[PDB]
A paper describes a structure:
The genome of [name] also encodes a highly homologous [name] ([name]), a Na+ channel with >100-fold larger Na+ to K+ permeability ratio. Here, we use cryo-electron microscopy to determine atomic structures of these two channels embedded in peptidiscs to elucidate structural foundations of their dramatically different cation selectivity.
Remarkably, this third channel that we named [name] is Na+ selective, with a relative permeability ratio PK/PNa > 100-fold smaller than that of HcKCR14. On the outer surface of the [name] trimer 21 sterol lipids are bound, which all were modeled as cholesterols. In [name], the water molecule is H-bonded to Ser73 instead, and the other water is missing. A possible mechanism for this selectivity is that in [name], Ser73 directs its side chain towards the carboxylate group of Asp116. The distance between the OH group of Ser73 and the COOH group of the Asp116 side chain is 6.2 Å. The S73I mutation increased K+ selectivity of HcCCR5, indicating that the polar side chain protruding into the cavity is a determinant for Na+ selection. Presence of Y222 instead of T222 in HcKCR1 occludes the channel pore compared to [name].
Numbering used by the authors:
A (entry chain A), B (entry chain A), C (entry chain A): 17 to 256
Amino acid sequence: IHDMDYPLLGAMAAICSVFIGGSGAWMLYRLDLGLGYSCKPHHSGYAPEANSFSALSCLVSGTIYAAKTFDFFDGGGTPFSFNWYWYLDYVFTCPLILLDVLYTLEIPHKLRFVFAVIITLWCGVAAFVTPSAFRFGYYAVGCVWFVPFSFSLLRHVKQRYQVYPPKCQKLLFWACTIFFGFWPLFPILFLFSWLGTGHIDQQAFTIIHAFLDLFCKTVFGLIMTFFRLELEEHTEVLGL
Amino acid sequence: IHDMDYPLLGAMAAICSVFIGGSGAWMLYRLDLGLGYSCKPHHSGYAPEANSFSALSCLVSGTIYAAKTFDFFDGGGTPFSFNWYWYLDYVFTCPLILLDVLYTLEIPHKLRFVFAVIITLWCGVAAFVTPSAFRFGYYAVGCVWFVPFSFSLLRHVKQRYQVYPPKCQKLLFWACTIFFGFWPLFPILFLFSWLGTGHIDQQAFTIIHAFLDLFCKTVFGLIMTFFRLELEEHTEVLGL
Amino acid sequence: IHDMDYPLLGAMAAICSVFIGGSGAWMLYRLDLGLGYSCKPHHSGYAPEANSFSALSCLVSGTIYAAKTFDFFDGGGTPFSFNWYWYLDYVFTCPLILLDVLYTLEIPHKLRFVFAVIITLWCGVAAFVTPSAFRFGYYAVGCVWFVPFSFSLLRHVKQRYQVYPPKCQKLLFWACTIFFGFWPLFPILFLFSWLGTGHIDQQAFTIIHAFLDLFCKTVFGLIMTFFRLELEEHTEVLGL
Ligand SMILES: CCCCCCCC/C=C/CCCCCCCC(=O)OC[C@H](COP(=O)(O)OCCN)OC(=O)CCCCCCC/C=C/CCCCCCCC
Ligand SMILES: CCCCCCCC/C=C/CCCCCCCC(=O)OC[C@H](COP(=O)(O)OCCN)OC(=O)CCCCCCC/C=C/CCCCCCCC
Ligand SMILES: CCCCCCCC/C=C/CCCCCCCC(=O)OC[C@H](COP(=O)(O)OCCN)OC(=O)CCCCCCC/C=C/CCCCCCCC
Ligand SMILES: CCCCCCCC/C=C\CCCCCCCC(=O)O[C@H](COC(=O)CCCCCCC/C=C/CCCCCCCC)COP(=O)(O)OCCN
Ligand SMILES: CCCCCCCC/C=C\CCCCCCCC(=O)O[C@H](COC(=O)CCCCCCC/C=C/CCCCCCCC)COP(=O)(O)OCCN
Ligand SMILES: CCCCCCCC/C=C\CCCCCCCC(=O)O[C@H](COC(=O)CCCCCCC/C=C/CCCCCCCC)COP(=O)(O)OCCN
Ligand SMILES: CC(C)CCC[C@@H](C)[C@H]1CC[C@H]2[C@@H]3CC=C4C[C@@H](O)CC[C@]4(C)[C@H]3CC[C@]12C
Ligand SMILES: CC(C)CCC[C@@H](C)[C@H]1CC[C@H]2[C@@H]3CC=C4C[C@@H](O)CC[C@]4(C)[C@H]3CC[C@]12C
Ligand SMILES: CC(C)CCC[C@@H](C)[C@H]1CC[C@H]2[C@@H]3CC=C4C[C@@H](O)CC[C@]4(C)[C@H]3CC[C@]12C
Ligand SMILES: CC(C)CCC[C@@H](C)[C@H]1CC[C@H]2[C@@H]3CC=C4C[C@@H](O)CC[C@]4(C)[C@H]3CC[C@]12C
Ligand SMILES: CC(C)CCC[C@@H](C)[C@H]1CC[C@H]2[C@@H]3CC=C4C[C@@H](O)CC[C@]4(C)[C@H]3CC[C@]12C
Ligand SMILES: CC(C)CCC[C@@H](C)[C@H]1CC[C@H]2[C@@H]3CC=C4C[C@@H](O)CC[C@]4(C)[C@H]3CC[C@]12C
Ligand SMILES: CC(C)CCC[C@@H](C)[C@H]1CC[C@H]2[C@@H]3CC=C4C[C@@H](O)CC[C@]4(C)[C@H]3CC[C@]12C
Ligand SMILES: CC(C)CCC[C@@H](C)[C@H]1CC[C@H]2[C@@H]3CC=C4C[C@@H](O)CC[C@]4(C)[C@H]3CC[C@]12C
Ligand SMILES: CC(C)CCC[C@@H](C)[C@H]1CC[C@H]2[C@@H]3CC=C4C[C@@H](O)CC[C@]4(C)[C@H]3CC[C@]12C
Ligand SMILES: *C/C=C(C)/C=C/C=C(C)/C=C/C1=C(C)CCCC1(C)C
Ligand SMILES: *C/C=C(C)/C=C/C=C(C)/C=C/C1=C(C)CCCC1(C)C
Ligand SMILES: *C/C=C(C)/C=C/C=C(C)/C=C/C1=C(C)CCCC1(C)C
Ligand code: NA
Ligand code: NA
Ligand code: NA
Ligand code: NA
Ligand code: NA
Ligand code: NA
Ligand code: NA
Ligand code: NA
Ligand code: NA
């Protein structure tokens, strides 16, 4: 039950908020500094509108983990708790992470992809709060939205993986590893959680997701940031 | 009260999810196939961004009816139930249906119209959960947003009903019949429901709305899809 | 506690809904009338898409105050009550007010600014419902998002305050006074409220916020409307 050693989870949540939140703040600073590695002024002058999704996803996640930190240190149940409804926080963060990939890579069908992940996460929120055997009904519906989304999105990334120069491809390889290697790791964790098989307790479930958000938001956002800097440093700083 | 024969409503909800959800899936397949009846590749190559609203509205509604199916078969009240808050589901579906009309017909004031329907539905959600005599206060406020919206939107459709060729006008006539003939049928049903006059019980209220969503989303979405195909088959496949 | 003389607050809420709601309705009428003071037809023909934020913010606020009026006159606690969760209503209105400034003045970073105010208000909603000493944790996180937002947004406004002619600058001065003089007055009120210091009771807290919304939405929206009319009357009606 809710015997999760909140001081440990509150301390863990505080670290995630600082590192995830701090990483987002750093990315905002780098946005309004230049185009690529060189301090070349932006064509519009301030920054492209679509370059802030990597920074915003970490800032929003860092803020949400700050809310988690308050909830844990408050002793457990709180009127405004992101820990009560699992995957509810990811509803407002995954679209930003996804939009970072779509706009950075110029992947079409940006409207369909965003809806496919929002509904995927909402099915997770509904699956979590359902105490009956129908919790896997919502889970199945979520996978129906997710599997075509991941496979369809993967195909688009492969198409545009070729145009980029080999130097940028190395950075895009590690972004793909996190995006296509860690995102499908959340539904797997659901099956093995206390709601599913039972091999992962709630306290350990929070800790693992804390590390997943570090890679999915901070590490992934920084990789996208440096991929973008490398992309601009080669495309619009000296030609081609 | 809540004596609604959930097995009947769950079975009905399952049919709606498959047909509405399946219709949305079919429309997605047709999008990435060609411009019109002929398999002419799209100008952008994949598809226009605004052609997915018809498909997304049915997919979202089909997913929501899947959630309704779980709620009904679970025995009634569920922690994640779309049946507890009536008209809450339409908040996330009507804008998609409306945006299908606005972008397909290129009707201006797309920002005002979307807000007018979202507030209209929210007043319905508030009107439903209010047990006091003020439930008609929210209903009246909803109609204040709806009547100018329907009349103002109707005027715009009449303006652009003339430019389209007679073959496309026939398809637009039936889209207008559903959009301007069934949408005002929901507020009428509210007055005659158990909350209003009392002539429609809750069980019958769900069944009627199930059929309305079949016409408002599946039939309407398909009519828009074929109107779009007919429009493209005449405008950007052979000239004018 | 909840001894707030609801008939007084309901009567006050009704006045705000009519004046704020009515002002938004008036601004919609002026939009589809002409460009500036003269009745010059719009370049697009109907209206720019970004000119409706001033009208929509008042219409949404007027509608929400109508919901508040029902909640107060119903006797207090209501299933659909905007008065139970303070600052929840501002989540759906402040972005519209902010977007009015951003699009009217063409301030870049429109995506970052909107997120900075939505998270700022959500921290206020969480801060309000928290009964523990951590209510100031959410408040502090909200100020962390707000102070950089207000200072960063202020710098942008100063940059574009110079290009406009002196006649338009006078109208922009009073918009800045409300935007940068009243917005920071809400967090100050939180500290002195019954949740903070204790010098402002809940009944007086509602009355003060009623007057703040009159200036922040109605007066501010009208100033933006006339600033826009003055701007168009000088830029795209006779040249420069
Ligand atoms: C359910 C939660 C889902 C979360 C997703 C929310 C994020 C929404 C994604 C926004 C997509 C916007 C596309 C960005 C790329 C556009 C690039 C561009 O040109 O920008 C257009 C222009 C900026 O550039 P200009 O100054 O015109 O520069 C051109 C001259 N140099 O305006 C824009 O940036 C587009 C609009 C900006 C945002 C408008 C508001 C949209 C909503 C914001 C977030 C709120 C929704 C999330 C709700 C939070 C929970 C309640
Ligand atoms: C309260 C619930 C309300 C529900 C409404 C949500 C739907 C929001 C409507 C989105 C409007 C977008 C306009 C679509 C037409 C634009 C056509 C276009 O050119 O697309 C721009 C470009 C795609 O094309 P490019 O690759 O640039 O192609 C050009 C080169 N060939 O990007 C776009 O599609 C625009 C932005 C895409 C979506 C961005 C995210 C917006 C939010 C998504 C839905 C989430 C909100 C609903 C919340 C769900 C409940 C929590
Ligand atoms: C969490 C609550 C946050 C609230 C914020 C919601 C507001 C979202 C802001 C929308 C930003 C749109 C930018 C407006 C400027 C664009 C100007 C423009 O050219 O418009 C594009 C074109 C209109 O013009 P055309 O007919 O192409 O004219 C060109 C030929 N003369 O389309 C548009 O207006 C852009 C898209 C319109 C809105 C699409 C739907 C977006 C969502 C609407 C609000 C719903 C979200 C709020 C949720 C409410 C709570 C559940
Ligand atoms: C119901 C209307 C919902 C409308 C949306 C409003 C937003 C919700 C804001 C929080 C209000 C919560 C009030 C709950 C009252 C206290 C209940 C409580 O104690 O909490 C839990 C139950 O309630 C919750 O925990 C509800 C938490 C809701 C949190 C949802 C957060 C959504 C915010 C969106 C943010 C978008 C991203 C921006 C970042 C924000 C950073 C702060 C335990 O319940 P008890 O009453 O003790 O009963 C059990 C004891 N026998
Ligand atoms: C309060 C914070 C709200 C913040 C938003 C969070 C989203 C809500 C997700 C569901 C959490 C529900 C937890 C409720 C706990 C159980 C309560 C319950 O049993 O259910 C009902 C009451 O609660 C409900 O039914 C609440 C249902 C909320 C559903 C709202 C769905 C919104 C989702 C948006 C989706 C956007 C579109 C994507 C498609 C999704 C497809 C799955 C009966 O109440 P009891 O406690 O039995 O009391 C009566 C017994 N004497
Ligand atoms: C929980 C799922 C949330 C999902 C979103 C659904 C939207 C919520 C719509 C309102 C449903 C409220 C049902 C609450 C059941 C009654 C509870 C009640 O009596 O009210 C309060 C508690 O509940 C509330 O007050 C919840 C109010 C939620 C209002 C949130 C409004 C959000 C709407 C967004 C609108 C977007 C802008 C458009 C303008 C709309 C204009 C109408 C007092 O509680 P009692 O049960 O008496 O317990 C105390 C007695 N010992
Ligand atoms: C430790 C406390 C202050 C929180 C710091 C969190 C953020 C701000 C820190 C954590 C790790 C940091 C990154 C570590 C390594 C690099 C590589 C270097 O070539 C550029 C800076 C960059 C990308 C750093 C930016 C700042 C960073 C993202
Ligand atoms: C493949 C796509 C198109 C269809 C997806 C159908 C999914 C949602 C269906 C297939 C089998 C179904 C499950 C079959 C049996 C049960 C047992 C019951 O006591 C609870 C519901 C539950 C667990 C069902 C939930 C819904 C379910 C998982
Ligand atoms: C559990 C996790 C960490 C490991 C799984 C990582 C997976 C997702 C990684 C490992 C190898 C990667 C692939 C390596 C090569 C290519 C070819 C390129 O043209 C498109 C991307 C694509 C197809 C990558 C997609 C992501 C990928 C499949
Ligand atoms: C019965 C089960 C499989 C659910 C099927 C639901 C969806 C996929 C079905 C229901 C009715 C079907 C439509 C029936 C008639 C036509 C007209 C034809 O000229 C093109 C296909 C089209 C438009 C069909 C597409 C698929 C469709 C929309
Ligand atoms: C026409 C526009 C601009 C104004 C709309 C005003 C509407 C919202 C007003 C007009 C008359 C009002 C009703 C008058 C009397 C009552 C009885 C009371 O016990 C509950 C509220 C209720 C039912 C009111 C709700 C609000 C109401 C319906
Ligand atoms: C109860 C329902 C099914 C029947 C009511 C259907 C109504 C909404 C239908 C019946 C006839 C239709 C009208 C027929 C002709 C025109 C002229 C055209 O230039 C614009 C659309 C317009 C104005 C239609 C709007 C929709 C309409 C009024
Ligand atoms: C009193 C009742 C009807 C509610 C009226 C509310 C709205 C519609 C009223 C309140 C104050 C009014 C404004 C008062 C002064 C002016 C200045 C004038 O040069 C143009 C009209 C304008 C801008 C008015 C427009 C209508 C207005 C905004
Ligand atoms: C400046 C930025 C980057 C960091 C902001 C840190 C804020 C959120 C920190 C600084 C000091 C903290 C407070 C320190 C002590 C307490 C007492 C405790 O019983 C409740 C929480 C509370 C009230 C903390 C809430 C969070 C807090 C306000
Ligand atoms: C409590 C409230 C009502 C009074 C405080 C009003 C403040 C916010 C007002 C008073 C004077 C105003 C400043 C007057 C002059 C300028 C210079 C211009 O180039 C940019 C705006 C700017 C910088 C204004 C910003 C808003 C401002 C600082
Ligand atoms: C930073 C957080 C991220 C990137 C979270 C991603 C989460 C998912 C891809 C979750 C997917 C799920 C499904 C496929 C179905 C079942 C429920 C979920 C929510 C675990
Ligand atoms: C697929 C579902 C659709 C198209 C639903 C449409 C619903 C409406 C137009 C509802 C309108 C209402 C009002 C006019 C006021 C009172 C409340 C409503 C919600 C019934
Ligand atoms: C019409 C209403 C408006 C313009 C409301 C504006 C509200 C704010 C700027 C609120 C700000 C807050 C913070 C800075 C932190 C603490 C909580 C708030 C919500 C009071
Ligand atoms: Na957000
Ligand atoms: Na994936
Ligand atoms: Na990727
Ligand atoms: Na949705
Ligand atoms: Na209508
Ligand atoms: Na129509
Ligand atoms: Na709204
Ligand atoms: Na400010
Ligand atoms: Na301003």
